[PDB]
Amino acid sequence: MLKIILPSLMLLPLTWLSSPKKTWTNVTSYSFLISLTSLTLLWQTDENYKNFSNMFSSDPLSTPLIILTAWLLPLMLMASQNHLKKDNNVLQKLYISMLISLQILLIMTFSATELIMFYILFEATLIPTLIIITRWGNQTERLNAGIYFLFYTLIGSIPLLIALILIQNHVGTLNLMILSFTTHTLDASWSNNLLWLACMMAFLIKMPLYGVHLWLPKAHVEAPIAGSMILAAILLKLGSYGMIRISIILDPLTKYMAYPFILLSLWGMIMTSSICLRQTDLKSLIAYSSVSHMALVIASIMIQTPWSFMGATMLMIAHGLTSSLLFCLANSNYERIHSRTMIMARGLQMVFPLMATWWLMASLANLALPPSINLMGELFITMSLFSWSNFTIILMGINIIITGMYSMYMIITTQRGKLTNHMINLQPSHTRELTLMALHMIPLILLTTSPKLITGLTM
Amino acid sequence: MNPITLAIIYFTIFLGPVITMSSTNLMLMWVGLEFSLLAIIPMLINKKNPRSTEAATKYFVTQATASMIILLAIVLNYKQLGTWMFQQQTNGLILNMTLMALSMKLGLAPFHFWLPEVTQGIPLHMGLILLTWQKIAPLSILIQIYPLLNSTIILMLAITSIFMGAWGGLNQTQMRKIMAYSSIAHMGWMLAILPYNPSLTLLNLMIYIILTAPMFMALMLNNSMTINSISLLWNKTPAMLTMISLMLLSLGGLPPLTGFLPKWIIITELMKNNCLIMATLMAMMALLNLFFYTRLIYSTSLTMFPTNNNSKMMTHQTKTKPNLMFSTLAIMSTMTLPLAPQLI
Amino acid sequence: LRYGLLAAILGDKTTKKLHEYSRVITVDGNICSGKNKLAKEIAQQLGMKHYPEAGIQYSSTTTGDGRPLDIEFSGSCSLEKFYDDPKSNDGNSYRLQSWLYASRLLQYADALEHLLSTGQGVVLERSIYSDFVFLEAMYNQGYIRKQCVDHYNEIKRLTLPEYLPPHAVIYIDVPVPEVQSRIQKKGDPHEMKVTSAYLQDIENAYKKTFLPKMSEMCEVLVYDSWEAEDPTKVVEDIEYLKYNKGPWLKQDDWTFHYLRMLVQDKTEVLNYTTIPVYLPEITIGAHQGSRIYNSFRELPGRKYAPGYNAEVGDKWIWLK
Amino acid sequence: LDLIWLEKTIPKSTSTLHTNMTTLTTNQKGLIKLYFMSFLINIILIIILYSINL
Amino acid sequence: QWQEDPEPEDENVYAKNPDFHGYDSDPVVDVWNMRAVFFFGFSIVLVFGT
């Protein structure tokens, strides 16, 4: 792991000491190589997980998030290359440094053994995101968005610190291997239900729940792009990972402190997908879809079954890839029209007949297409929920219907129709922004060809 | 001021607290506090304007009463036990009166009403000394008597300082008052733990000084005293926004910066004694302490404000003011968390 | 060794440097009255140095290579555009006015840095104590909106009392037709198209306001054209002045020291001019301001502090 | 829900509460008379708390 | 008004360097950026990693 996060640190001098004309290239290529060397930790020939030190470990839940975080960086970096091309070189390099800092801190999170390491890094991730959203957003609502996105997190996370501190004072170590093998059943009192809530309602904010999600549209809609990629791809999964790690020390309270959150997730998933059915803003449509997806992950982690954790991991990775892809696809048009309004430009597939295939595949990923790690996750958590209660499929099916609807409606009212003939500024395409979608989709196909990796702790 | 006078006055300022530390008699302790009092007023009142006169009068009149109350506590102890030291088996009323007067000296809530006023009434220097060096001897008194203090008002005052500093700094456009309310909040964090491992009180003190001194220097470099004046810094001296940002985000304690260590370890040692919900309240109002720092650093570093035509002259000319210690103190803040076990 | 308390203690005081002609002396007047021709000869005869009228470009000349810069760095103002379009919506008028006040202010500061450092006297012309004249002229016409007057007078209020006034002022008067015909015989298409009420209001401002309030602190030497010619007579009047009635008499070495320190730092000098009072005639927006600042730090001699520019020819840069 | 009521309940209630507390708290006037009266009130409360708790 | 610059209008690229790829203005840098991306991303990562 050290061999993954030291080169990631060396990517920063590589930015600052290189020419202005040979800085995107070098850092992009070397980031791809970091992604390559982040495959050694998929060499798990055994059941025992990979401990490299007291600091760092890597389980089959860590490794996909690690690899995806190392893999997104070149994509963020190339997507961020048309805008801030007319920016001063120092400003460019500051953007690069923030993205690399995100990479490093997120790898450290997913590789951490203790919960306090994970805490300080889970919170250090806020500073790059806030800077990216605020200094490089295009609109004026970015400031309120940053405030929301920061303070929801901090409100949720201060109780988390208090609970971790309590657990240290009670057990002594706060390490995840030892909390696994030494976990006392809880006495089922209010003093422990508050502990459950303090441990959970930091991650549940970040995933997010439907009661608390207003930070995610305001941020996705206003972050330039790369912030949106990350905020859709791994910052939401940074809560699911934490829940999967911390739930082991909360049994048996999860059997009854989970009803409200499963229920909120399910109903609010339906609510969010219905919103996606009727939404003027494309970058908000993607965001509400992300809420409607992560709600299933919430319910799944609450059920704590093998099928459920499995499907949660699958849906995590799949949603991350396809959501980053859809944000790229919307940015591709926003870099020309400079409008997020979707019904503005609605008759493409004449000018962009190849991007319109990436659109289609991105949507089919989004809706439940079977030979895909999206439907595998959605199906397995549907099966877990049916085992839990047979009356949940009534809601999952409504979601499936609406999720076909808003995705196909997006495709239709953006591509299909009559071309907006008043748009002379529809430049043909960028090889860069075609390679982007290819690099988002080719992993989906590969992982569908081999989902033995993309499962989690339980398979 | 001629040099003889500056020598005398700064020697007196340095010797007030130094007498306060290296003294077992509480009366020479009082003497040191009074040297700190006497010698500060000339430099508070140096620019000779009504604001300075008001600041100096408020400072003097608030500190004299606290001094008399401390002397009362000392004389009552001398009557009780025939000694010049707060032993055990002293009266809690004596000790609590001492605590009250020391809180009035520091600037803690509900004795906080004078600190932001006085600080606005004086230059950036004499805010630095007032907020950093004058806090060290009054804290030394409490540190020397930490197992004798009542653990109840010590925490109520801390909680009031936290809440009121946060709420006051929420709405202050003036920076010289933001620094004051920050002082109030951080003294609250200190005083809360002072009966519990007072090494951490000195830790928070050193961290707070190391953060505030370079911030005051940043304000000094262009004589910035307002959000709108610090906002014209992407034009005048734009190489400072990085350090200003990280220092503000250390002040409002965020993890990767070392300004989170004092709050974190304070919460630790407070949960080690079942002081749980108080620490929860404190940690949840530190967020509001962070909010106005975030607003400020938006205003100066992320959303560059309009500037003027006459600010190009500043670009023509050159500067010499950064004392080479701003760098060291700003980098030893904001980047020294991984060395925290060597700090504790 | 940069000057400071250590130097003053070592013995680099000021009162040792003043001999007789250690004098801030300003020559004032209207648009074309014979100020430079007179100030130059005063400086020659008495042993001072001439400090010409601070225009749009004094900072540029006293900084860097000492050349004129493009007009967007040395302000955003043109005097020609003021004469050919004095009631623009684009606030060229007050932008110019405030830029010139700041330039006169830096000029006076450089002057005092020279005087107290060396004891050598200084001849100025139309200092910061006589710049409000043109503002009042503009405001009596419709060339300024009144908020700009408040801005100017506030900056004056903040900047003026810190500095000492001149010892004597030399206001040479000319009637308005005489100066108007002199402008006609000057050879400028733009100064030619100036009114007569503008000049008469300049004259009224001078004679009413600037003369008595400076006679309360300075030695006025009102002359006319036939007296302004032959500088030697004006010089021979200056030689025999009793320099009483002012705040220079109550100055110690340490007052001079703190003035010398305020004046050695041009940023403290100009701080109160860069205030964020948001007048549309003075604000320049973030995008334009950033473009200007970048393009200014991408010039020869700029982009770093003075000695640290190897593209110019500086050396020992890795050892400074 | 999302654009009015989830905004009015969770975030905007917080904002209004904290800013209203700020207003009624920090709208003080620079008079040492009133500050010192409050200091006296604090003296009284501390001595009463001592006499009661004991 | 407050003396800001106006909006720079819609840039078109393919006027200059109609073989533009998406990376930079210099035609050499675009080529040696796309070759870098394609090589290091497809030919080594997506092949040897598989």
Partner: peptide, 19 residues
Amino acid sequence: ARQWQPDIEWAEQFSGAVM
């Protein structure tokens, strides 16, 4: 099209002494 930076109406709210 262009990145938004503040204007005078956004700056004037930070000049009232109490906010």
